[PDB]
Design a protein around this ligand. Structure first.
Ligand SMILES: Cc1c(N[C@@H]2CCC[C@@]2(C)O)ccc(C#N)c1Cl
Lengths: 10, 244
């Protein structure tokens, strides 16, 4: 879930 | 003009590719730098999209989905504008440290696609697109690709997209003159989609054979290209065209 990780990280 | 204030405020600044311009223009080095840039741009697209008016009203799964689906088109559109503003569309200005000349276009094996992108870039000159028109169009592009059987909350999406179309209308209006302009801009927006599809096809093909051609894909890129892009290429996710 790389994209989800980025989406929630920012 | 609240809406336009916001669009200008959230517009990303300069993004470098990290390209070592001293190494020779090989296929593997050019595309590896393009992929790094693609990922850096995706990070910026996420932060931009989440700060757009109304965007947080979308169901969260739909938020993630439209960003992933529209990413390629958004990148192409913005790159076209950079190319126009910086080098009058004579070359492809992917980044300050990664400007494609004809030799790089050939060496990247992306020549025909680059030609199509250069033509899009030239449209900004031919249509004399204003910065305000560019910003509203780019925001609409985010809301121009969806699954055929719909988003989790399609109704909220439909309302938001309607409001972004209205904002574009107001920018034009700022009657036959408005009408002609709106037609030109919707036609320009539709024309991004086939270009984005070609890049999607090229990128997918490249990912599949990437181990064989020594092209590096960042993990998050490889995820989106393998998980989301094939939904587009298989026809499960499609553009919303203005003109049929
Ligand atoms: C069309 C494009 C890219 N395409 C490359 C081609 C192969 C895969 C890819 C997505 O990395 C990459 C970065 C930018 C930027 N900025 C733009 Cl406009």
């Amino acid at each position: 879930g790389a994209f989800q990780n980025l989406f929630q990280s920012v | 003009p609240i809406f336009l204030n916001v669009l200008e405020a959230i517009e990303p600044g300069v993004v470098c590719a990290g390209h070592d311009n001293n190494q020779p223009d090989s296929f593997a080095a050019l595309l590896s730098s393009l992929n790094e840039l693609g990922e850096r741009q995706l990070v910026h697209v996420v932060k931009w999209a989440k700060a757009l008016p109304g965007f947080r009203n979308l169901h969260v799964d739909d938020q993630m989905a439209v960003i992933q689906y529209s990413w390629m088109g958004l990148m192409v559109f913005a790159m076209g504008w950079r190319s126009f503003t910086n080098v009058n569309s004579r070359m492809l200005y992917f980044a300050p440290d990664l400007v494609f000349n004809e030799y790089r276009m050939h060496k990247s094996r992306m020549y025909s696609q680059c030609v199509r992108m250069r033509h899009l870039s030239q449209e900004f000159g031919w249509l004399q697109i204003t910065p305000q028109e560019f910003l509203c169009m780019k925001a609409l592009l985010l809301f121009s690709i969806i699954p055929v059987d719909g988003l989790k909350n399609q109704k909220f999406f439909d309302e938001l997209r309607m409001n972004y179309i209205k904002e574009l209308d107001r920018i034009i209006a700022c009657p036959t003159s408005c009408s002609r302009r709106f037609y030109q801009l919707t036609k320009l927006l539709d024309s991004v989609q086939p270009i984005a599809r070609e890049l999607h096809q090229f990128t997918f093909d490249l990912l599949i054979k990437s181990h064989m051609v020594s092209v590096d894909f960042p993990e998050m890129m490889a995820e989106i290209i393998s998980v989301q892009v094939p939904k587009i290429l298989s026809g499960k996710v499609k553009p919303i065209y203005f003109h049929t």
